[PDB]
Amino acid sequence: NESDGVTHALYPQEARLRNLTYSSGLFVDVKKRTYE
């Protein structure tokens, strides 16, 4: 998640030097189905 120019591969060298957080993200697969 960038300051401006946005979302980018991050190598460990750079996370160290920019105080970043060598992270990846999580994606599920969601379902709407109706029940009250």
Place this chain on the structure above:
Amino acid sequence: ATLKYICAECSSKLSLSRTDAVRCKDCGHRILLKARTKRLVQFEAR
């Protein structure tokens, strides 16, 4: 004619400040090196 800064990565004398960004010129890389004085520094070789 001059120096001020360097590109960590794409290796290439940049030179810029405030309202300027903090990025680059032919690498878009956000890490920057200051760059050596020309005042000359001396060593005693001891």
